[PDB]
């Protein structure tokens, strides 16, 4: 997260860290045994870390649970990045105020909606600086038109842009798979962009409201 602020310990209870010997992606807890993240974050040997604030020191509120199954959307396209969503089943159920699940959306959010984006990704647009603690950012959802203007022929109906055209505030490496929460509902998943916090290049997110039925049924039959 570039241009954000320190969230404060366990103030984003649904935020998870995907660990493979080190933090490589974020994710959101949607129920005691399931996590949603990005499809490009698929990796073998994933350990999910819940209740984290400082990802470098054991603070006592953590729960490290291995993934038993990782389900990448059947239509995920690694070239176009369309359908960049994945479900991770925990090997055991997490014990749910410092660890809680986030609600799925009943409807899609409109342009202008203010959302909270969180993650342990790079905090520098030009440079490298990974934080110990969780960072937060409030950014508005942008209209489909402007999103398509920023990324010609790359935006599908399953993607939305959020951020500031001026730049300076955005998600970055290390944030992929993390949550974009608006009005208490999970609306997006950090996915891709052109650099971080660049002017006229807002971040691109997976539009969760289009996958709700797939998520509910997939979770139930696995």
């Amino acid at each position: 997260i570039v241009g954000g602020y320190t969230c404060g310990a366990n103030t984003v209870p649904y935020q998870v860290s995907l660990n493979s010997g080190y933090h490589f992606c974020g994710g959101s807890l949607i129920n005691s045994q399931w996590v949603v993240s990005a499809a490009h974050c698929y990796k073998s040997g994933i350990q999910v870390r819940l209740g984290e604030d400082n990802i470098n020191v054991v603070e006592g509120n953590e729960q490290f649970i291995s993934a038993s199954k990782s389900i990448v959307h059947p239509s995920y396209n690694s070239n176009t990045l369309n359908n960049d969503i994945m479900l991770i089943k925990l090997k055991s159920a997490a014990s749910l105020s410092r660890v809680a699940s986030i609600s799925l959306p009943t409807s899609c959010a409109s342009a202008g909606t203010q959302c909270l984006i969180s993650g342990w990704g790079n905090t520098k647009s030009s440079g490298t600086s990974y934080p110990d603690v969780l960072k937060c950012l409030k950014a508005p959802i942008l209209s489909d038109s402007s999103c398509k203007s920023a990324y010609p022929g790359q935006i599908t109906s399953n993607m939305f842009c959020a951020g500031y055209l001026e730049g300076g505030k955005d998600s970055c490496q290390g944030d992929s798979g993390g949550p974009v929460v608006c009005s208490g509902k999970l609306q997006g998943i950090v996915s891709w962009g052109s650099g971080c916090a660049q002017k006229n290049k807002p971040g691109v997110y997976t539009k969760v409201c289009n996958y709700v039925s797939w998520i509910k049924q997939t979770i139930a039959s696995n």
Binding site: F24, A38, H40, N122, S176, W192, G193
Partner: protein
């Protein structure tokens, strides 16, 4: 020669550590890969990197 190409992080926002052959240093080094659209000078281990590109 793809072994001579600089490392490519790509457009995705992950922080995945991979290896690339650094022809200047004559060795495989680590870099941050974003998770998608990998070019060929991108390996999961130093051994794979040295086998494919070593000595380029």
């Amino acid at each position: 020669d793809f072994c001579l190409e600089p490392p490519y992080t790509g457009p995705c926002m992950a922080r995945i550590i991979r290896y690339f052959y650094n022809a200047k240093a004559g060795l495989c080094q680590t870099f941050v890969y974003g998770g998608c659209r990998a070019k060929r000078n991108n390996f999961k281990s130093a051994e794979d990197c040295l086998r494919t590109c070593g000595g380029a």
